[PDB]
Amino acid sequence: MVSQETIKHVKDLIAENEIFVASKTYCPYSHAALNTLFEKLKVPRSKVLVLQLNDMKEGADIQAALYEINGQRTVPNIYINGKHIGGNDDLQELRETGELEELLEPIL
Numbered sequence: 001m002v003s004q005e006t007i008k009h010v011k012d013l014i015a016e017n018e019i020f021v022a023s024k025t026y027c028p029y030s031h032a033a034l035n036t037l038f039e040k041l042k043v044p045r046s047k048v049l050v051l052q053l054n055d056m057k058e059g060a061d062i063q064a065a066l067y068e069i070n071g072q073r074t075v076p077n078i079y080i081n082g083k084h085i086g087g088n089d090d091l092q093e094l095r096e097t098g099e100l101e102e103l104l105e106p107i108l
C-alpha cells in the first residue's frame with residue numbers, strides 16, 4: 001500500500017494550493033479541465049498546482065494516495081480550496097448547476 005508519508009505529502013499539496021489538479025500530459029479530460037479553468041474561467045495560473053503524474057517519479061504513488069483519500073481512480077483529480085471536486089465531468093457538472101461560481105469566488 002501507499003506509505004503514510006506519501007498520503008501526508010499529497011494532503012499537504014492539496015491544502016497548500018487554492019486549486020490542485022492531478023493530471024497526465026496525454027489526458028484529453030485533463031486538457032479540457034485545465035482549458036476550462038485557465039481560459040474559460042480565467043483562473044490565475046499562480047492559484048493552481050498542476051501535477052503531470054506520468055512525468056513524475058512519484059506519479060504512481062500519488063495517484064494511489066489519491067484513491068486512498070477520495071476513492072477516485074482517474075485523472076484529472078481536482079480539488080478547490082481543499083474540497084474534492086472530482087474529474088472533468090464533475091467540474092462541468094458544477095458549472096451547469098451554477099454551483100462552481102460560489103466555489104471560485106474566494107479564489108477570483
Ligand SMILES: N[C@@H](CCC(=O)N[C@@H](CS)C(=O)NCC(=O)O)C(=O)O
Pocket residue numbers: 024026027028029073074075076086087088089090
Ligand atoms: N469521466 C472522467 C474520465 C477521466 C479519464 O478517463 N481519465 C483517464 C486518462 S485520459 C484515466 O485516468 N485513466 C486511468 C489512469 O490513467 O489511471 C473525467 O471526466 O475526468
